[PDB]
Design a protein around this ligand. Structure first.
Ligand SMILES: O=P([O-])([O-])O
Ligand SMILES: O=P([O-])([O-])O
Length: 240
């Protein structure tokens, strides 16, 4: 329940393939096979990111969601490409249980409110993708590649105000490094919101999950290290 497995996928020669290391590594593993494995290992939720859709605002990859839905009984978080109200409806109709949004929310924060006021707050996860810039935490869109000029402290406050239910807090610089979560970013964010925080990016071992919880994370997300060591999913699942 505190364990989210983030699966990043892309069509490669007609096949849905799994990507790790912040979308830089084609693992050669099929989405089909990895989804089956992650549930078997004990994950509580799946964050399903269609890496081709991120930042594009063209809609969620509902083909990918429909593909995955009969493979698993786990809640699915649709991620990548949300741009308007109708996009969320399509995601739910494809089988998603919650929806995640970054780029279009930054550009139009009232979208968060629109979603929450229809599909509640708990169905809405706002993905915050941040890093240190000139000594301050700043917010980025398009998976971290595009600046906004918005401070993390400001955005966190706004996100809750607009009615999000959960924050997915990704440290751009930690993703795929397996070097630990950005616990200073987490600690920074914790007293700014009452919302459940999902720590994202950098998990490499069991003690990393511990430090994240200690810094204030309510749930933890794992991609790269889980693919390399699926039993890690079980160990953390059996613990929290
Ligand atoms: O597309 P996104 O993931 O929402 O930024
Ligand atoms: O891959 P990740 O996100 O670092 O877990």
């Amino acid at each position: 329940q505190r364990v989210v497995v983030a699966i990043v996928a892309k069509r490669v020669d007609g096949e849905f393939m799994v990507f790790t290391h912040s979308g830089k590594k084609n693992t050669g593993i099929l989405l089909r096979d990895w989804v089956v494995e992650v549930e078997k290992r004990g994950a509580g939720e799946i964050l399903l990111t269609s890496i081709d859709r991120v930042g594009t605002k063209s809609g969620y990859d509902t083909e990918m969601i429909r593909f995955v839905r009969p493979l698993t009984t786990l809640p699915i978080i649709a991620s990548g490409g949300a741009g308007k109200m109708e996009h969320f409806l399509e995601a739910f109709l494809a089988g998603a249980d919650k929806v995640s949004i970054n780029t279009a929310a930054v550009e139009n924060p009232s979208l968060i409110t629109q979603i929450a006021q229809t599909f509640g707050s708990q169905a809405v996860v706002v993905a915050i993708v941040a890093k240190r810039v000139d000594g301050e935490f700043m917010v980025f869109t398009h998976s971290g590649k595009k600046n906004t000029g918005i401070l993390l402290r400001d955005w966190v406050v706004e996100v809750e105000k607009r009615g999000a239910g959960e924050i997915l807090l990704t440290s751009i610089d930690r993703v795929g490094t397996k070097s630990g979560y950005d616990t200073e970013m987490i600690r920074f964010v914790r007293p700014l919101t009452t919302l459940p925080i999902i720590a994202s990016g950098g998990a490499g071992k069991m003690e990393h999950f511990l430090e994240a919880f200690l810094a204030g994370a309510d749930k933890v997300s794992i991609n790269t290290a889980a693919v390399e060591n699926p039993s890690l999913i079980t160990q953390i699942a059996q613990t929290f």
